[PDB]
């Protein structure tokens, strides 16, 4: 490719005219700074850094005084220094001969060194008596002459550090020999060996070698690497081809006489090892992490690339062109004869390369993907125990906390009945199902969920942020929105005044008043308020009940709820808010259940929320939760009561005696809601004086009941998610949780290459450079352990990770906490379900010859039962060719599978599965072309023992309509809107039990229950967070799993 | 008192790690002869800028030599002993054969101009009547004057009985002195097979 | 360097297939002109062009700017307009909070952020997300994608081109911006090409962009894109891939696997964009589920992707424009 | 009903790593507390608590000077505890030797303690001579060696 | 201990009593003289303990 | 210290029998000379790494 440059000079070209070398110093007396000389102020730090051409200007000691670098920082006004700067810019002259000739360049370098020392040094007394020395027409004649009138050899300039206020001694010193012609150089660089440490590089400035000269060895190194990281870019662009501006062709320094560090830094330079990056470089400690990479570099070599590093290393004395590299000098030196070139050369062919290592010191802790199977062949390896992390970089809590906004919180969905009718012999039955239940309490698996997950420290940080947000800053919030709802109870203890309805307080002179006070309950009442308003009338817009109204709260502990919920209202005229309660203080009046016979307690909404009873037996349970309604039907117009153990006889034994002693038929609907811990299986019953006559009033079905209608008995309970740290490689049994700890560097490739047969997701970062540990963060997942440990081939892609070491991990500083319990999407929680309900079918019945799942991801996989049964997915779009051929026995026929009856592939333990069905495209629009696509679906079915699973999708209207909480799985008009997809259409569920009863035999709908969110949520340990726990049980419902399994 | 614990808090020595900036010693050491040909530096000489006190550093960037390293060259273009890989000296002035105010002893004025306003802040804790503080304050310009007399004779002649003697034979060695921050000299061991060095 | 106006930096330009059939004797035929020039690179002399002219340092003073005048004065800016866009991106390290909308901050107390960070990259990233929300609805005026839906990136190294893209939408509700790459770090999950068979990926609309691959070979340099179109054609709904080398062989072999494959055709328009160095030869593939079928499918003439199929060879390639003095 | 737990540890597994422990108290340097220390104001009150490791750890006398505590509040500036406290953090140094294996925690409590006397008391002049005595890999083990090297029969 | 510590904490002793000393001095105020021969004592007396 | 804290650990005598072999008492013990003449050799002499 030969790529092409310019040699464009920088050092020469910056040297003004003598004529004009006035203005450029002093009489920049006129304008005043501001541009060039940049500064910036990190905060104890900053760096004042004047440029071109006051850069490579050395500061005169004495003349180094002045207020300038007398203000050190100490504090900097902008205005100040750049005042001050011009005060010392000023004064500063540098003697001169003005000429005429138009070739004449003024010698800057080196005439402002003597006005740096005092004229005291010959070399500066010579530039005294005739000034006019320093014209020179041509570069190296303007040295030349400063050689031949002096009879010494060589002069030595110090180089001043970068900053100005950085006042310290210099690393190094550069030095200019007097040199001529060719068989010149090559003296000097001779002469030059036993001789300290010394370095050149490449080519030169002017045509004049000139060597560097290093204080303390160690000193050396990290200028010696601020050069080579300057040098793998510009061969980045010489690489890709394009005109490069800068000038030396190859910037890497050269060791002449140097030390033994530097060796084995120059060969690990010089084959240029890294690629790309531009992820912000640190410039500082480069040297160290540079370093660091040689030798791991080594520790790879196969024989070849040993051999060549290995004479880098005994050599060090010839810079190594590669070819092409080597032809840009050859390109020039023609361009242009006498110009003197580092003369030892060794030039390159093929290299060779392997690998590359992507190095970045940025910040940030990497997230990795480990894909089963790879190029290596892994066999009977270690077991890499790592652990013990620490309580400062590690912090492990179990929750989890969840984050969304403020509409978000607050929601409910409501439910609806079904029948009409209460039969006489289901009643006593009904009885009997409640009754037997009540006395085993439910499942003590269940148990250890509801006590730990709370929405006390779940809505916890949502709150504390808007509580700092108001005690500064904060604008506008208006009257009414659930905004001046949110901020006048879950922060602030005193009031929040308004003032033109927008302003919302707006200044506090500064005594700041506590953050409030709720209570794992205070949530729960004022997300519920808000849907007795709502529930009251469906348009949006109030929250601020009508004036000289009452609202009347039960509780066994109320208050702050109902100090929260009161100054809500302070504005709006007179508004009385009152609390009953077992254990309330003022203004709340203490009263226990079942209160006594005097009492009146007049109010509009009540909304009744006890359950202080221990009670014991199942009659004196009964009796007290159906009494506290009835003293609460009479008492309000518009309330709900709250009833504990909703089993379809308790529930419907309520409707029951309100129905027969009023006005014939209440209009009743049960109500779950948002910040109500999820899954606590308790449910709002909502009464109101009706219309006319209700037309279904009791429930039949009652799926929500059935949620608590599930919870069946103890065997095993006991789960508790542990932590484990030891992998050993394709060794099954590891019981759910996940493991951290920290390895060695040199091994952290083994490790990542091992966590693959266990998991997926895997985090890792090293701390700071030095440490040379890299704590590993890893989740077992069930999800992978059925695609892992299907044969033996264990494989593996160890070659591509270990390309990493040493920097390629990340780097973090400060705590970082991962919790126990993760969070999820309510549609990734749902399908977790579909399967462990599956699950359980496949592993029980007789004989299979495989499990053919029909359309979806390769995923889903999991309930392939057992992992070692034929496995067939049957789907256009999929990834083929490597687990297929690494016999993870699978196969993938990438036909659009046509379901229309017309020939279809059967034949004998067949086990379909179908939880697609929405259209072979995204569309799922075919809604009438479904109930016939599921009638030649089930249609040509005479292939004796199969069985096959089909899911759905039902109800609508009283679910959307009437819920209210669009949170995630929101519908719109007929369409159910999940995830992602389109929008889904419905189909009428009793077609389906109306027709295929006459032409199939089997069709059995679960739906999944309690039992599969428990053991699903147990093994992945991922932890639901409101908004879809009350959104959950209604959706979760209507997704049927009809399974055909006849003959 | 008041920052002096801020000091000698950080540590009382140091060393230099493998290529890079200084490593102080938590600890609170007295200092002693047998370590300076050893490891470890008096850290009251170092020259990290503490953010603690300022003062007791301040006073110490007051300790600095005015010098340049003379390579002798005519001592080994005559063909004499060296023990060094290369020759070095370090002669401690300079010449000023033109300035109108002699230098060195300029940079002299700067130690008394500020040695003298910490002298004040104790004569402000004890207060003693304004003769006492002015009978010192008074011998400080005498002391100082004196130096501007001798300046002449210890830059252009004192300077040059220097520059010659680091050209004498049996002079061997390089007692380089600019930078006290890091400087150690060499140990040259005679070894032999068996028994000790 | 140039200098124009804000909205004159996100703009791109559409265009349309024309051809409705595919011949089998001109598919061979289009086969071996892409075979017989992908070994030979493009032109040499046109290269040291791209390499050159980059829009990171063209648009470098058009930002420059917009940050200095916001460290003092500044007033309006309005949630949305592609100056809200612009701040929120180019300038300013921190969030630009809001107030009653108009207010666009407004005051901070003396403590000054830092400039922002673009690398050669993001400036392409943001003018085609624009573009995204456009191509959706003609109609003007939105760039806050609607709450609680997700975008996901894909790309080699992403970051800050999410970081800037995500903290635009800070103020509406819950929506998720998440990254993909072979070189990313958090948030940005890493992961390889061409991807495990364990990944579900779901999302709206995805942009992808990757092109890590010496890959060795036209065969193997062919499956690699295709199938990466494939997995991100399920993956989305409005989705637009990102093809290399557009040679009429290639880019309509792409149109046939999805076509072929799915509910018989897709809607297909290839598209340029402002913020791409001006010359990179590469265009954007953007795929859609349809409406009812397409008509004219397939680039019989293909004029864009002509650009490319022009680089022929190198012959005195070398220019470098001097100076001269006398 | 026999209910579940978890044996989760606390003061154990909050000793930072030997190797770097040289960071989480001297090279806090870098940044710049704020939210950690925690400090509430009623109002004659206050409490200022640093925690985390900085919590169990007692102050040295004399070297409990310096304007941190000096500032009783007699007024406080929430700029002022800020950066000033940041000054005190800054100079704490406790002695100790960087390690290569993986499987060591140093031993903050009893290691500190020391440091607060001035290393005066043999338990503190142990830790002097080879501070690598406080290098453990299993608790327990940890005191077990500064009893053994002592004939002492219990520290307080 | 470099410098003794128990005679360290002698001097804060000497170092805030002396300065309840000077406010009595500015209430009598006597000349320099007298106020200095006594702030000298304290001097001596606390050199003696180290 | 440290290896006196680990040497300890294993104890301070042992007895030269099982034939063979050694058998280490892990509990530190004076010596007193009084003992000199039994089965116990004083473990600090031992060899053992």
């Not at chain 1, 740290?725 to 060794?731: C, D, E, P, Q, W």
């Not at chain 1, 040493?806 to 400060?814: C, H, T």
């Amino acid at each position: 490719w030969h790529y092409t440059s310019i040699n464009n000079d920088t050092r020469v070209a910056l040297d003004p005219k003598p004529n004009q070398i006035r203005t450029i110093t002093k009489p920049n007396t006129v304008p005043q700074l501001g541009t060039d000389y940049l500064y910036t102020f990190n905060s104890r730090s900053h760096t004042l850094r004047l440029l071109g051409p006051f850069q490579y200007f050395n500061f005169s000691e004495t003349d180094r005084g002045h207020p300038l670098f007398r203000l050190p920082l100490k504090y900097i006004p902008a205005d100040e220094l750049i005042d001050n700067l011009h005060s010392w810019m000023r004064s500063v002259h540098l003697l001169h001969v003005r000429s005429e000739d138009n070739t004449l360049r003024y010698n800057w370098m080196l005439g402002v060194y003597a006005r740096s020392t005092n004229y005291t040094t010959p070399v500066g007394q010579l530039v005294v008596n005739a000034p006019a020395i320093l014209n020179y027409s041509n570069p190296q004649d303007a040295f030349n002459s400063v050689f031949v009138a002096l009879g010494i050899d060589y002069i030595d300039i110090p180089i001043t550090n970068s900053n100005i206020f950085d006042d310290s001694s210099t690393p190094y010193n550069v030095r200019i020999w007097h040199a001529p012609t060719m068989t010149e150089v090559n003296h000097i660089l001779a002469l030059m060996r036993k001789s300290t440490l010394v370095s050149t590089h490449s080519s030169w400035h002017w045509n004049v070698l000139h060597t560097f000269h290093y204080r303390s060895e160690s000193d050396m190194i990290d200028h010696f690497a601020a050069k080579i990281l300057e040098d793998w870019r510009q061969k980045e662009k010489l690489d890709k081809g394009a005109l490069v501006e800068a000038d030396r062709v190859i910037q890497r320094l050269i060791p002449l006489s140097s030390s033994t560090y530097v060796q084995r830094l120059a060969a690990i330079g010089a084959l240029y090892p890294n690629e790309f990056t531009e992820n912000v470089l640190d410039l500082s400690r480069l040297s160290t992490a540079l370093l660091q990479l040689s030798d791991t570099y080594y520790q790879h070599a196969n024989d070849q690339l040993r051999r060549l590093y290995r004479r880098m290393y005994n050599d060090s004395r010839t810079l190594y062109m590669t070819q092409r590299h080597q032809e840009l000098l050859l390109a020039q030196i023609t361009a242009d004869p006498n110009i003197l070139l580092y003369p030892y050369t060794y030039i390159f062919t093929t290299i060779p390369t392997s690998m590359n290592y992507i190095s970045n010191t940025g910040q940030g802790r990497i997230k990795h993907s480990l894909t089963v199977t790879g190029a290596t062949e892994h066999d009977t390896v270690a077991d890499i125990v790592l652990g013990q992390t620490g309580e400062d970089v590690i912090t492990i809590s179990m929750v989890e906390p969840m984050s969304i906004a403020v509409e978000d919180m607050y929601g409910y969905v409501l439910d609806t009945p079904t029948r009409d009718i209460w039969p006489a012999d289901e009643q006593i039955e009904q009885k009997g199902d409640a009754v037997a239940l009540y006395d085993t309490k439910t499942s003590r698996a269940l148990g250890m969920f509801n006590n730990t997950v709370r929405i006390d420290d779940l809505l916890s940080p949502l709150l504390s942020l808007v509580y700092r947000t108001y005690i500064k800053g904060d604008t506008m919030t208006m009257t009414q929105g659930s905004l001046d709802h949110l901020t006048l109870c879950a922060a602030v203890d005193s009031d929040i005044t308004f003032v033109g309805n927008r302003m919302i307080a707006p200044l506090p002179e500064g005594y700041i008043p506590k953050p409030m006070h709720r209570n794992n309950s205070t949530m729960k009442m004022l997300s519920l308020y808000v849907a007795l308003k709502k529930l009251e009338n469906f348009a949006t817009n109030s929250y601020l009940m009508a004036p000289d109204t009452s609202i009347i709260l039960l509780g066994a502990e109320r208050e702050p709820a109902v100090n929260i919920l009161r100054r809500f209202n302070r504005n709006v005229s007179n508004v009385r808010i009152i609390g009953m309660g077992d254990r309330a203080v003022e203004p709340n009046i203490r009263v226990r259940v079942p209160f006594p016979i005097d009492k009146n307690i007049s109010a509009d909404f009540i909304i009744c929320d006890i359950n202080s009873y221990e009670d014991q037996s199942f009659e004196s349970m009964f009796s007290e939760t159906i009494s506290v309604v009835t003293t609460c039907a009479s008492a309000a117009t518009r309330a709900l009561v709250k009833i504990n153990h909703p089993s379809e006889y308790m529930i419907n034994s309520v409707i029951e005696r309100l129905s027969q002693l009023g006005g014939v038929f209440y209009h009743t609907a049960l109500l779950k809601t948002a910040s109500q811990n999820p899954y606590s299986y308790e449910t709002y019953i909502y009464i109101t004086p009706i219309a006319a006559a209700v037309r279904f009033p009791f429930y039949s079905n009652s799926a929500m009941i059935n949620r608590y209608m599930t919870a069946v008995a103890d065997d095993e309970m006991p789960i508790i998610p542990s932590i484990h740290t030891v992998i050993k490689g394709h060794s099954n049994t590891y019981s759910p949780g996940l493991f951290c700890g920290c390895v060695d560097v040199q091994s952290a490739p083994l490790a990542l290459s091992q966590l693959k047969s266990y998991c997926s997701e895997a985090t890792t970062w090293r701390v700071d450079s030095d440490d040379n540990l890299v704590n590993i963060i890893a989740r077992i997942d069930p999800a992978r352990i059925a695609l892992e440990f299907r044969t033996r081939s264990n494989t593996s892609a160890y070659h591509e990770y270990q390309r990493y070491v040493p920097n390629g991990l990340g780097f973090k500083v400060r705590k970082t906490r991962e919790f126990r319990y993760m969070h999820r999407e309510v549609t990734f929680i749902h399908k977790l379900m579909m399967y462990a309900l599956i699950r359980e079918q496949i592993s029980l019945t007789e004989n299979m010859t495989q499990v053919v799942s029909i359309g979806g991801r390769n995923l889903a996989d999991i309930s392939v039962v057992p992992l070692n049964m034929k496995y067939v997915v049957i789907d256009p779009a999929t990834r083929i060719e490597t687990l297929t051929q690494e016999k993870k026995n699978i196969e993938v026929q990438s036909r659009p599978f046509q379901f229309d009856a017309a020939n279809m592939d059967l034949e004998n333990n067949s086990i379909y599965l179908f939880i697609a069905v929405i259209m072979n495209e995204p569309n799922g629009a075919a809604t009438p072309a479904r109930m016939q696509m599921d009638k030649i679906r089930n249609v040509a079915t005479a292939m004796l023992t199969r069985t096959n699973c089909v899911a759905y999708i039902s109800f609508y209207e009283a679910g959307i309509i009437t819920r209210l909480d669009q949170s995630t799985a929101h519908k719109t008009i007929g369409r159910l809107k999940v995830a992602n997809y389109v929008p889904v259409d419905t189909l009428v569920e009793a077609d389906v039990t109306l027709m295929l009863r006459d032409i199939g035999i089997t069709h059995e709908i679960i739906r999944p229950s309690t039992p599969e969110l428990i053991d699903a949520c147990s093994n992945y340990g991922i932890r639901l967070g409101s908004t879809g726990g009350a959104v959950l049980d209604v959706f979760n419902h209507y997704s049927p799993v009809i399974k055909l399994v006849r003959s | 008192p008041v920052e002096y614990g801020i000091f000698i808090q950080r540590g009382a020595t140091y060393t230099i790690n493998a290529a890079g900036e200084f490593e102080f010693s938590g600890r609170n050491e007295k200092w002693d002869q047998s370590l300076y040909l050893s490891e470890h530096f008096p850290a009251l000489f170092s020259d990290v800028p503490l953010a603690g006190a300022n003062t007791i550093i301040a006073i110490m960037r007051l300790f600095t030599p005015q010098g340049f390293l003379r390579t002798d060259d005519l001592a080994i273009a005559a063909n004499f002993p060296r023990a060094s890989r290369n020759p070095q000296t370090y002669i401690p002035y300079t010449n000023q054969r033109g300035t109108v105010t002699n230098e060195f002893a300029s940079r002299f004025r700067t130690i008394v101009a500020t040695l003298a306003n910490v002298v004040n802040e104790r004569a402000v804790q004890d207060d003693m009547q304004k003769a006492t503080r002015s009978c010192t304050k008074q011998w400080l310009r005498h002391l100082e004057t004196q130096f501007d007399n001798i300046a002449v004779a210890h830059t252009d002649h004192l300077s040059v009985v220097y520059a010659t003697m680091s050209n004498f034979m049996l002079n061997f060695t390089n007692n380089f002195s600019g930078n006290h921050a890091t400087f150690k000299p060499d140990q040259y061991v005679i070894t032999s097979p068996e028994g000790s060095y």
